[PDB]
Amino acid sequence: IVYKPVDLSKVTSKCGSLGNIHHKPGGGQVEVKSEKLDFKDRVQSKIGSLDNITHVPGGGNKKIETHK
Amino acid sequence: IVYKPVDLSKVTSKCGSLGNIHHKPGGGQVEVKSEKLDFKDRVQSKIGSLDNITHVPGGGNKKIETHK
Amino acid sequence: IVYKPVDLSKVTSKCGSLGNIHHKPGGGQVEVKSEKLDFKDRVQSKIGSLDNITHVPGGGNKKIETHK
Amino acid sequence: GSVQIVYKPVDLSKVTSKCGSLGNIHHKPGGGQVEVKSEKLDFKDRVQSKIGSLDNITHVPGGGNKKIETHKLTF
Amino acid sequence: GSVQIVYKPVDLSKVTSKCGSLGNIHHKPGGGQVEVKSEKLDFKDRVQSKIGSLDNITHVPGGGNKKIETHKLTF
Amino acid sequence: GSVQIVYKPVDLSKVTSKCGSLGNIHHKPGGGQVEVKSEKLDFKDRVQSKIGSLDNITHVPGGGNKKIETHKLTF
């Protein structure tokens, strides 16, 4: 009996933002005038920002191998 | 008996934003004038922002292998 | 009995933000004028910021191997 | 009989280039007042600027001359 | 019989270049007042600037001359 | 019989370059007042600047001369 299994396999995950190009991004002019405004609950505001947000809860690898 | 399986497999996931080009993105002019507004619940606003949001809960690999 | 199983396999995760290019990002001008505003709950505001944000709860690798 | 060759080409030629500004008269030229006001500008790439009341500019990449002569006598 | 060869070519030629600003008259030239006001400017790449009331500029990459003669006598 | 070769080529030619600013008259030139005011400027790469009322500039990369003669007599 000769027993010589060979594993050369790749298991790979590439999750999120990868290899992207962002060349000169951004708006020319952004202007806001706010007068006598009332807010009575939570405010989120973005004015002329650049946001690059990545969440990766995933991308996990499981390899199980058994020999008998 | 010779027992000699060869595994050369690739298992691959490419999840999210990959290899993109964003060349000079953005609006020319953005202008907002707000006067005497009342808000009585949550406000979300984006004014001339650039957002690149990626979520990857997925992209997981499971490889199970047995030999006998 | 000859028993020579060979594992040379790769298990790999590339989770988050990887190999990206951000060449000269940013808006030209951002201007805000605020007068007589009332806020009565939490305010989050971004004015002209650049934010690169990455969360990776995932990307974990598990390899199990057994021989008998 | 005998053989006689006389080879006497004479060259009196002129090759001339006159390029740019030659022999001009500029009598009392007046550049006016120049005002440049800039606020809140953004430049993401290379800037070349010239500001000035009175410019005389002469640029001459050309005006080159090439003269070739071959003289050959084979007996 | 006899052979006589008289190779007597003559060159009196002129090859000439006159490139740029030659022989001009600039009589009382006046560059007026120059004002540059700059506030809150941003430059992310190379800046070249010139500011000035009166400029005379001559640039001459050209005006080169090339003369070739080849004389050959073969008997 | 006899052979006579006379090889007497004459060159009195002229190769001339006159490049740049030559023989000009600048009589009483006036550069006016120059003001440069700068506030809150930002530069992320190389800056070249010149400021001044009156400039005379002559730049000559060219105006070169090349002369070749080959003389060959083969009997």
Short mmCIF file of C-alpha atoms in Angstrom, two decimals:
data_model
loop_
_atom_site.label_atom_id
_atom_site.label_comp_id
_atom_site.label_asym_id
_atom_site.label_seq_id
_atom_site.Cartn_x
_atom_site.Cartn_y
_atom_site.Cartn_z
CA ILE A 1 0.00 0.00 0.00
CA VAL A 2 1.38 3.44 -1.07
CA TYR A 3 -0.64 6.44 0.18
CA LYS A 4 0.53 9.78 -1.31
CA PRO A 5 -2.36 12.27 -1.77
CA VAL A 6 -1.04 15.75 -2.82
CA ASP A 7 -2.85 19.03 -1.99
CA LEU A 8 -1.57 22.12 -3.86
CA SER A 9 -4.96 23.95 -3.79
CA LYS A 10 -5.61 27.66 -3.04
CA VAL A 11 -8.53 28.80 -0.87
CA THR A 12 -8.67 32.61 -1.17
CA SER A 13 -10.97 35.50 -0.21
CA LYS A 14 -10.56 39.10 -1.50
CA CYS A 15 -13.26 41.03 0.39
CA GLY A 16 -13.84 44.81 0.71
CA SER A 17 -12.27 47.51 -1.48
CA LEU A 18 -9.27 46.24 -3.51
CA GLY A 19 -7.07 47.57 -6.35
CA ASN A 20 -9.36 50.62 -6.97
CA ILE A 21 -8.08 53.94 -8.38
CA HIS A 22 -9.54 57.28 -7.22
CA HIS A 23 -7.88 59.90 -9.43
CA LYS A 24 -8.50 63.60 -8.45
CA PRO A 25 -11.98 63.03 -6.80
CA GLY A 26 -13.93 65.99 -5.30
CA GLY A 27 -16.61 68.61 -6.15
CA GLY A 28 -15.61 72.10 -7.41
CA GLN A 29 -17.61 74.40 -5.06
CA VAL A 30 -20.04 73.43 -2.27
CA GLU A 31 -21.95 76.22 -0.48
CA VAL A 32 -24.58 76.08 2.30
CA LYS A 33 -26.45 78.97 3.95
CA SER A 34 -28.67 77.90 6.85
CA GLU A 35 -30.88 80.45 8.62
CA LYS A 36 -33.42 80.08 11.50
CA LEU A 37 -33.63 76.24 11.20
CA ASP A 38 -35.02 74.18 14.15
CA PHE A 39 -34.03 70.49 14.58
CA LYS A 40 -35.75 68.35 17.32
CA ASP A 41 -34.14 64.91 16.67
CA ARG A 42 -30.72 63.58 15.51
CA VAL A 43 -28.95 65.28 12.57
CA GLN A 44 -26.32 63.67 10.34
CA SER A 45 -24.85 66.00 7.67
CA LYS A 46 -22.00 65.74 5.14
CA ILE A 47 -21.02 68.93 3.28
CA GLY A 48 -18.34 68.45 0.58
CA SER A 49 -16.68 65.49 2.41
CA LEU A 50 -15.09 62.45 0.73
CA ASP A 51 -15.82 59.16 2.55
CA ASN A 52 -14.30 55.72 1.69
CA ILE A 53 -16.01 53.30 4.11
CA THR A 54 -15.46 49.50 4.10
CA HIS A 55 -17.09 46.86 6.36
CA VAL A 56 -16.04 43.19 6.04
CA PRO A 57 -17.89 40.94 8.54
CA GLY A 58 -17.44 38.17 5.91
CA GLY A 59 -14.47 36.84 3.90
CA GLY A 60 -13.76 33.93 6.31
CA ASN A 61 -12.15 30.71 4.99
CA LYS A 62 -12.71 27.21 6.46
CA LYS A 63 -10.61 24.28 5.11
CA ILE A 64 -11.33 20.85 6.62
CA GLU A 65 -9.23 17.91 5.42
CA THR A 66 -9.18 14.32 6.75
CA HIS A 67 -7.19 11.16 5.87
CA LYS A 68 -7.88 7.53 6.95
CA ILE B 1 -2.78 -0.42 -4.15
CA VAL B 2 -1.40 3.04 -5.07
CA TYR B 3 -3.50 5.91 -3.66
CA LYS B 4 -2.30 9.21 -5.17
CA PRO B 5 -5.05 11.85 -5.81
CA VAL B 6 -3.64 15.30 -6.81
CA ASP B 7 -5.56 18.47 -5.88
CA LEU B 8 -4.67 21.68 -7.79
CA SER B 9 -8.06 23.42 -7.20
CA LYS B 10 -8.60 27.16 -6.68
CA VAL B 11 -11.55 28.26 -4.52
CA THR B 12 -11.82 32.07 -4.79
CA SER B 13 -14.14 34.92 -3.77
CA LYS B 14 -13.79 38.54 -5.02
CA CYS B 15 -16.52 40.37 -3.09
CA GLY B 16 -17.14 44.14 -2.74
CA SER B 17 -15.56 46.83 -4.96
CA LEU B 18 -12.51 45.61 -6.93
CA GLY B 19 -10.37 47.05 -9.77
CA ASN B 20 -12.61 50.15 -10.36
CA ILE B 21 -11.36 53.49 -11.77
CA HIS B 22 -12.92 56.78 -10.57
CA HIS B 23 -11.35 59.48 -12.75
CA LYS B 24 -12.07 63.13 -11.68
CA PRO B 25 -15.53 62.43 -10.06
CA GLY B 26 -17.49 65.35 -8.50
CA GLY B 27 -20.12 68.01 -9.34
CA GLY B 28 -19.09 71.53 -10.53
CA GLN B 29 -21.14 73.74 -8.16
CA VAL B 30 -23.56 72.72 -5.39
CA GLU B 31 -25.49 75.46 -3.54
CA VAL B 32 -28.15 75.23 -0.79
CA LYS B 33 -30.06 78.07 0.91
CA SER B 34 -32.28 76.95 3.81
CA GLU B 35 -34.51 79.44 5.67
CA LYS B 36 -37.12 78.89 8.46
CA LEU B 37 -37.23 75.04 8.13
CA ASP B 38 -38.64 72.99 11.07
CA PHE B 39 -37.57 69.32 11.53
CA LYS B 40 -39.37 67.11 14.14
CA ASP B 41 -37.69 63.74 13.36
CA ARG B 42 -34.19 62.53 12.28
CA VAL B 43 -32.45 64.33 9.40
CA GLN B 44 -29.80 62.77 7.15
CA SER B 45 -28.33 65.09 4.46
CA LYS B 46 -25.48 64.88 1.93
CA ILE B 47 -24.56 68.13 0.12
CA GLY B 48 -21.87 67.73 -2.58
CA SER B 49 -20.18 64.77 -0.75
CA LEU B 50 -18.63 61.75 -2.50
CA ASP B 51 -19.26 58.47 -0.66
CA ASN B 52 -17.68 55.08 -1.55
CA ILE B 53 -19.36 52.61 0.83
CA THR B 54 -18.74 48.83 0.64
CA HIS B 55 -20.29 46.13 2.89
CA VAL B 56 -19.20 42.46 2.52
CA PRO B 57 -21.02 40.12 4.99
CA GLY B 58 -20.52 37.33 2.37
CA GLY B 59 -17.50 36.12 0.34
CA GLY B 60 -16.82 33.21 2.76
CA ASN B 61 -15.28 29.97 1.41
CA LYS B 62 -15.86 26.48 2.91
CA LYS B 63 -13.78 23.59 1.46
CA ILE B 64 -14.37 20.13 3.03
CA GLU B 65 -12.27 17.17 1.84
CA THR B 66 -11.97 13.52 2.99
CA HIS B 67 -9.79 10.56 1.90
CA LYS B 68 -10.34 6.87 2.87
CA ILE C 1 2.64 0.56 4.23
CA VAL C 2 4.03 3.90 2.89
CA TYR C 3 2.07 6.93 4.15
CA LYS C 4 3.29 10.26 2.68
CA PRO C 5 0.33 12.67 2.28
CA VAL C 6 1.63 16.14 1.19
CA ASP C 7 -0.24 19.39 1.92
CA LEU C 8 1.21 22.50 0.21
CA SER C 9 -2.19 24.31 -0.06
CA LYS C 10 -2.63 28.02 0.73
CA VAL C 11 -5.52 29.34 2.86
CA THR C 12 -5.61 33.17 2.60
CA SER C 13 -7.86 36.16 3.33
CA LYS C 14 -7.43 39.73 2.02
CA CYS C 15 -10.15 41.61 3.89
CA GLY C 16 -10.54 45.42 4.21
CA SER C 17 -8.96 48.09 1.96
CA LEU C 18 -5.94 46.79 -0.03
CA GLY C 19 -3.77 48.10 -2.91
CA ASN C 20 -6.05 51.13 -3.62
CA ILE C 21 -4.72 54.44 -5.04
CA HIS C 22 -6.12 57.82 -3.86
CA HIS C 23 -4.38 60.35 -6.12
CA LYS C 24 -5.05 64.04 -5.09
CA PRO C 25 -8.52 63.57 -3.44
CA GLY C 26 -10.39 66.65 -2.05
CA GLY C 27 -13.10 69.21 -2.95
CA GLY C 28 -12.07 72.63 -4.37
CA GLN C 29 -13.93 74.97 -1.99
CA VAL C 30 -16.44 74.13 0.78
CA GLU C 31 -18.24 77.00 2.55
CA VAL C 32 -20.95 76.96 5.27
CA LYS C 33 -22.76 79.90 6.92
CA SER C 34 -25.07 79.03 9.84
CA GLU C 35 -27.30 81.58 11.64
CA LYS C 36 -29.85 81.14 14.49
CA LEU C 37 -29.94 77.30 14.29
CA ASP C 38 -31.46 75.32 17.23
CA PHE C 39 -30.48 71.63 17.69
CA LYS C 40 -32.21 69.55 20.47
CA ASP C 41 -30.60 66.11 19.90
CA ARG C 42 -27.17 64.72 18.76
CA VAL C 43 -25.52 66.35 15.72
CA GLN C 44 -22.88 64.63 13.56
CA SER C 45 -21.41 66.91 10.87
CA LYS C 46 -18.54 66.63 8.37
CA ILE C 47 -17.49 69.81 6.52
CA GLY C 48 -14.85 69.30 3.78
CA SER C 49 -13.24 66.26 5.53
CA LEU C 50 -11.64 63.20 3.92
CA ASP C 51 -12.36 59.96 5.82
CA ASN C 52 -10.99 56.50 4.92
CA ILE C 53 -12.61 54.02 7.36
CA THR C 54 -12.22 50.21 7.47
CA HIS C 55 -13.84 47.67 9.82
CA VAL C 56 -12.91 43.97 9.51
CA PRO C 57 -14.79 41.77 12.05
CA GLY C 58 -14.30 38.91 9.52
CA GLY C 59 -11.42 37.61 7.39
CA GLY C 60 -10.65 34.77 9.88
CA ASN C 61 -9.07 31.52 8.61
CA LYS C 62 -9.69 28.06 10.16
CA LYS C 63 -7.75 25.02 8.84
CA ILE C 64 -8.49 21.60 10.39
CA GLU C 65 -6.42 18.61 9.23
CA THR C 66 -6.43 15.00 10.58
CA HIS C 67 -4.44 11.82 9.78
CA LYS C 68 -5.10 8.19 10.90
CA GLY D 1 46.16 63.65 -79.30
CA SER D 2 46.37 65.39 -75.88
CA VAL D 3 43.51 65.63 -73.31
CA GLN D 4 42.84 68.83 -71.31
CA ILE D 5 40.22 69.19 -68.50
CA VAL D 6 39.64 72.53 -66.72
CA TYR D 7 37.30 72.29 -63.70
CA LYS D 8 36.59 75.86 -62.47
CA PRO D 9 33.03 76.09 -61.02
CA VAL D 10 32.73 79.43 -59.15
CA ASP D 11 30.28 79.90 -56.26
CA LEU D 12 29.32 83.49 -55.25
CA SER D 13 26.00 82.46 -53.60
CA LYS D 14 24.37 83.84 -50.43
CA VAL D 15 22.16 81.76 -48.12
CA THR D 16 20.46 84.03 -45.54
CA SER D 17 17.86 83.70 -42.79
CA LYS D 18 16.39 86.78 -41.02
CA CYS D 19 14.01 85.52 -38.32
CA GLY D 20 12.31 87.18 -35.32
CA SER D 21 12.00 90.97 -34.89
CA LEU D 22 14.40 92.88 -37.20
CA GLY D 23 14.66 96.67 -37.69
CA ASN D 24 11.32 97.60 -35.99
CA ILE D 25 10.69 100.97 -34.29
CA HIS D 26 8.55 100.98 -31.11
CA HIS D 27 7.98 104.68 -30.31
CA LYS D 28 6.52 105.39 -26.79
CA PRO D 29 4.59 102.05 -26.38
CA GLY D 30 2.44 102.16 -23.21
CA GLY D 31 1.33 99.13 -21.18
CA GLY D 32 -1.70 100.05 -19.02
CA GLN D 33 -2.25 99.28 -15.32
CA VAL D 34 -2.63 95.49 -14.65
CA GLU D 35 -4.57 94.18 -11.63
CA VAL D 36 -4.95 90.46 -10.79
CA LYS D 37 -7.08 89.66 -7.71
CA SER D 38 -7.49 85.99 -6.73
CA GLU D 39 -9.41 84.53 -3.76
CA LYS D 40 -10.10 80.88 -2.74
CA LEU D 41 -8.62 79.16 -5.87
CA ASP D 42 -7.52 75.47 -5.95
CA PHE D 43 -5.11 73.97 -8.53
CA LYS D 44 -4.53 70.15 -8.70
CA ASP D 45 -2.03 70.32 -11.61
CA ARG D 46 0.82 72.41 -13.08
CA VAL D 47 0.35 76.18 -13.38
CA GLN D 48 2.26 78.48 -15.74
CA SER D 49 1.36 82.21 -15.45
CA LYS D 50 2.74 85.52 -16.76
CA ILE D 51 1.43 88.90 -15.55
CA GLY D 52 2.73 92.18 -17.01
CA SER D 53 1.90 95.55 -18.59
CA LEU D 54 4.13 95.52 -21.73
CA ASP D 55 5.82 92.41 -23.21
CA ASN D 56 8.06 92.15 -26.29
CA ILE D 57 8.72 88.43 -26.96
CA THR D 58 10.70 86.90 -29.87
CA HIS D 59 11.01 83.07 -30.06
CA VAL D 60 13.02 81.54 -32.98
CA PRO D 61 13.26 77.68 -33.15
CA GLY D 62 13.74 78.00 -36.97
CA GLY D 63 15.89 80.20 -39.25
CA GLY D 64 18.54 77.44 -39.71
CA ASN D 65 20.54 77.06 -42.98
CA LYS D 66 21.98 73.95 -44.69
CA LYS D 67 24.34 74.14 -47.73
CA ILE D 68 25.77 71.00 -49.41
CA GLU D 69 28.18 70.76 -52.37
CA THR D 70 29.66 67.65 -53.96
CA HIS D 71 32.36 68.21 -56.60
CA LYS D 72 33.38 64.99 -58.43
CA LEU D 73 35.72 64.58 -61.43
CA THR D 74 36.46 60.99 -62.65
CA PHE D 75 38.97 60.55 -65.54
CA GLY E 1 49.70 62.13 -75.90
CA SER E 2 49.77 64.27 -72.73
CA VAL E 3 47.01 64.64 -70.08
CA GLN E 4 46.36 67.93 -68.21
CA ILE E 5 43.80 68.31 -65.36
CA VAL E 6 43.24 71.72 -63.69
CA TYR E 7 40.94 71.34 -60.66
CA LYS E 8 40.40 74.99 -59.50
CA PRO E 9 36.82 75.32 -58.08
CA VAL E 10 36.21 78.56 -56.06
CA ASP E 11 33.82 79.21 -53.15
CA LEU E 12 33.24 82.88 -52.12
CA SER E 13 29.71 82.14 -50.75
CA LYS E 14 28.09 83.43 -47.52
CA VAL E 15 25.91 81.27 -45.22
CA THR E 16 24.26 83.61 -42.67
CA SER E 17 21.65 83.48 -39.90
CA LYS E 18 20.19 86.56 -38.13
CA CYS E 19 17.85 85.15 -35.49
CA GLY E 20 16.19 87.02 -32.59
CA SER E 21 15.83 90.77 -31.99
CA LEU E 22 18.22 92.65 -34.34
CA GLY E 23 18.56 96.43 -34.89
CA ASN E 24 15.20 97.40 -33.26
CA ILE E 25 14.61 100.81 -31.58
CA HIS E 26 12.54 100.95 -28.36
CA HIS E 27 12.08 104.66 -27.59
CA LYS E 28 10.65 105.52 -24.10
CA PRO E 29 8.69 102.20 -23.67
CA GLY E 30 6.53 102.30 -20.49
CA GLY E 31 5.24 99.29 -18.56
CA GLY E 32 2.39 100.50 -16.26
CA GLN E 33 1.74 99.55 -12.61
CA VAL E 34 1.26 95.79 -11.84
CA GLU E 35 -0.73 94.62 -8.79
CA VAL E 36 -1.16 90.93 -7.87
CA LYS E 37 -3.32 90.18 -4.78
CA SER E 38 -3.67 86.50 -3.81
CA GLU E 39 -5.65 85.09 -0.83
CA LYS E 40 -6.37 81.48 0.24
CA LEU E 41 -4.90 79.81 -2.91
CA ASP E 42 -3.90 76.10 -2.99
CA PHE E 43 -1.47 74.39 -5.45
CA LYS E 44 -0.95 70.56 -5.46
CA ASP E 45 1.55 70.62 -8.40
CA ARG E 46 4.39 72.68 -9.92
CA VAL E 47 4.01 76.46 -10.30
CA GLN E 48 5.94 78.68 -12.70
CA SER E 49 5.14 82.41 -12.49
CA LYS E 50 6.54 85.70 -13.86
CA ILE E 51 5.28 89.13 -12.72
CA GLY E 52 6.64 92.41 -14.14
CA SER E 53 5.84 95.75 -15.79
CA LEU E 54 8.12 95.65 -18.89
CA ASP E 55 9.74 92.50 -20.38
CA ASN E 56 11.95 92.17 -23.47
CA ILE E 57 12.52 88.41 -24.05
CA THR E 58 14.50 86.82 -26.94
CA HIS E 59 14.75 82.99 -27.13
CA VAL E 60 16.72 81.35 -30.01
CA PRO E 61 16.97 77.51 -30.14
CA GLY E 62 17.37 77.88 -33.95
CA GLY E 63 19.60 79.95 -36.25
CA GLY E 64 22.18 77.12 -36.72
CA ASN E 65 24.21 76.71 -39.96
CA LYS E 66 25.59 73.52 -41.62
CA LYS E 67 28.02 73.73 -44.62
CA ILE E 68 29.35 70.55 -46.32
CA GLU E 69 31.78 70.30 -49.25
CA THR E 70 33.17 67.04 -50.64
CA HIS E 71 35.81 67.44 -53.38
CA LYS E 72 36.86 64.23 -55.20
CA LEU E 73 39.28 63.78 -58.14
CA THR E 74 39.93 60.19 -59.43
CA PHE E 75 42.49 59.62 -62.24
CA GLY F 1 53.27 60.39 -72.33
CA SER F 2 53.19 62.95 -69.47
CA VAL F 3 50.39 63.55 -66.91
CA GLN F 4 49.86 66.88 -65.07
CA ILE F 5 47.31 67.24 -62.24
CA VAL F 6 46.82 70.63 -60.55
CA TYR F 7 44.54 70.47 -57.49
CA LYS F 8 44.03 74.07 -56.25
CA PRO F 9 40.44 74.44 -54.86
CA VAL F 10 39.89 77.82 -53.10
CA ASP F 11 37.48 78.42 -50.20
CA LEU F 12 37.05 82.07 -49.04
CA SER F 13 33.39 81.51 -47.98
CA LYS F 14 31.89 82.72 -44.66
CA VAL F 15 29.62 80.84 -42.23
CA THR F 16 28.03 83.29 -39.73
CA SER F 17 25.42 83.15 -36.96
CA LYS F 18 24.03 86.26 -35.23
CA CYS F 19 21.65 84.98 -32.57
CA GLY F 20 19.95 86.70 -29.61
CA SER F 21 19.62 90.49 -29.16
CA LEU F 22 22.07 92.40 -31.45
CA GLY F 23 22.46 96.15 -32.13
CA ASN F 24 19.11 97.20 -30.54
CA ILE F 25 18.61 100.64 -28.92
CA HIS F 26 16.55 100.83 -25.68
CA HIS F 27 16.19 104.58 -24.94
CA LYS F 28 14.84 105.53 -21.44
CA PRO F 29 12.76 102.30 -20.83
CA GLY F 30 10.43 102.52 -17.78
CA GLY F 31 9.27 99.56 -15.71
CA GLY F 32 6.41 100.74 -13.44
CA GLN F 33 5.68 99.82 -9.80
CA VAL F 34 5.14 96.08 -9.05
CA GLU F 35 3.17 94.94 -5.97
CA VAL F 36 2.70 91.27 -5.03
CA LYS F 37 0.59 90.60 -1.90
CA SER F 38 0.06 86.98 -0.81
CA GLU F 39 -1.94 85.57 2.14
CA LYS F 40 -2.69 81.95 3.19
CA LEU F 41 -1.13 80.29 0.09
CA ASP F 42 -0.26 76.54 0.10
CA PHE F 43 2.12 74.73 -2.35
CA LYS F 44 2.67 70.88 -2.37
CA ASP F 45 5.23 70.83 -5.27
CA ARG F 46 8.09 72.90 -6.83
CA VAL F 47 7.68 76.69 -7.29
CA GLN F 48 9.65 78.92 -9.70
CA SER F 49 8.86 82.66 -9.50
CA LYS F 50 10.33 85.94 -10.84
CA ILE F 51 9.09 89.42 -9.80
CA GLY F 52 10.52 92.73 -11.20
CA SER F 53 9.68 95.99 -13.07
CA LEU F 54 12.07 95.76 -16.07
CA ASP F 55 13.65 92.59 -17.55
CA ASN F 56 15.87 92.17 -20.64
CA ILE F 57 16.34 88.38 -21.22
CA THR F 58 18.32 86.69 -24.04
CA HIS F 59 18.52 82.86 -24.12
CA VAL F 60 20.41 81.21 -27.05
CA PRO F 61 20.62 77.37 -27.09
CA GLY F 62 21.08 77.62 -30.90
CA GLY F 63 23.26 79.71 -33.24
CA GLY F 64 25.85 76.89 -33.66
CA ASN F 65 27.85 76.43 -36.90
CA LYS F 66 29.17 73.18 -38.46
CA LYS F 67 31.56 73.15 -41.45
CA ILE F 68 32.88 70.00 -43.20
CA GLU F 69 35.35 69.77 -46.07
CA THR F 70 36.71 66.49 -47.47
CA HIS F 71 39.38 66.74 -50.20
CA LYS F 72 40.36 63.47 -51.99
CA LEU F 73 42.77 62.96 -54.93
CA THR F 74 43.33 59.32 -56.08
CA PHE F 75 45.88 58.67 -58.87
#
